[PDB]
Design a protein around this ligand. Structure first.
Ligand code: PQ5
Length: 331
């Protein structure tokens, strides 16, 4: 069958932890008092939850309440445990409280309020410096969570809150995140289509932190090239075709060979034969102000088929793309 794989970094971080850290099935939830919060207005809804601005009446603080739609106890425990383990880390959203919603007997997560600038509207205003700065801020959250033995597995613009006035960023929605254990076969049916790594699309289960770095590369491409989404597949199969038309089919088949991956036969007559394209075909008069040699070198080193060859978060932070930002933060 397939060749096994291990994270290059932070490989054994959870093995050295007490069992309780990662064994979320055993976690005992510390409930709080629902009557401390009053809902103010609805912010949005998804498959998994509805989100409200709210107020803590005991201190008149603004907070956000995420009312969970019914999922397994295990899934709720995993998100809670991860949020608690990561709490206080750089640019990690703060979980303030957990309450049992009386209406449905449903749990509600209570988060710190971030004054988020419009995500669709924000992108239209971002300069070259802003993209570098916010990318660096996301990398601080990813290096932290990876170093803590956790893969996010759903990195995308919707899950990055930006309070632009305060140059403040938070990585949110830890509902798909998981603990990394060497040898563990993970569920490939994760993340948003446009951000799925090749490992997911070819059904390679022994993946790791490096998944997040593919998703990040997809974000970077969409920002510097003004192309949202960058890899626009019609479904999961066509998503790999879209990637192959850019990264080329030679490297794809090399990856499949290296890991002895069994390719779904549906791929066979759709992948075809594609050259690896130069990034320069995506540069044009309206985006060129966002694109540098540095940006393209960095992007190239995130967007690799082989999960093992992508930059780590910590390596990415040392790339020349960030030298100006690093200098500015020291001062
Ligand atoms: O799932 C979480 O971990 C999550 C945590 C915090 C917030 C949202 C979350 O995800 C729901 C996304 O809904 C977007 C609604 N807009 C706003 C506006 C302001 N804030 N401040 C915090 C959040 C927020 N959401």
């Amino acid at each position: 069958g397939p060749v096994p794989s291990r994270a290059r970094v932070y490989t054994d971080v959870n093995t050295h932890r007490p069992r309780e850290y990662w064994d979320y099935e055993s976690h005992v939830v510390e409930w709080g008092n629902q009557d401390d919060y009053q809902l103010v207005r609805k912010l949005g809804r998804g498959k998994y939850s509805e989100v409200f601005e709210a107020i803590n009446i005991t201190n008149n603080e603004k907070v956000v309440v995420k009312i969970l739609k019914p999922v397994k106890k295990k899934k709720i425990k995993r998100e809670i445990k991860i949020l608690e383990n990561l709490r206080g880390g750089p640019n990690i959203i703060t979980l303030a409280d957990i309450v049992k919603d009386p209406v449905s007997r449903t749990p509600a997560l209570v988060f710190e309020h971030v004054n988020n600038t419009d995500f669709k509207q924000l992108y239209q205003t971002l300069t070259d410096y802003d993209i570098r700065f916010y990318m660096y801020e996301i990398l601080k959250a990813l290096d932290y969570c990876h170093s803590m033995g956790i893969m996010h597995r759903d990195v995308k613009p919707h899950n990055v809150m930006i309070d632009h006035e305060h140059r403040k960023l938070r990585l949110i929605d830890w509902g798909l995140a998981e603990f990394y254990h060497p040898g563990q076969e993970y569920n490939v049916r994760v993340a948003s289509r446009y951000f799925k790594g090749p490992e997911l699309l070819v059904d390679y289960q022994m993946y790791d932190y490096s998944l997040d770095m593919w998703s990040l590369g997809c974000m970077l491409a969409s920002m510097i090239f003004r192309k949202e989404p960058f890899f626009h597949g019609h479904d999961n199969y066509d998503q790999l075709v879209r990637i192959a038309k850019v990264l080329g089919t030679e490297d794809l088949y090399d990856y499949i060979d290296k890991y002895n991956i069994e390719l779904d036969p549906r791929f066979n007559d759709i992948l075809g034969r594609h050259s690896r394209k130069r990034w320069e075909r995506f540069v044009h008069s309206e985006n060129q102000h966002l694109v540098s040699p540095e940006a393209l070198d960095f992007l190239d080193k995130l967007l690799r088929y082989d999960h093992q060859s992508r930059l780590t978060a910590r390596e990415a932070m040392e790339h020349p793309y960030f030298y100006t930002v690093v200098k500015d933060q020291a001062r």
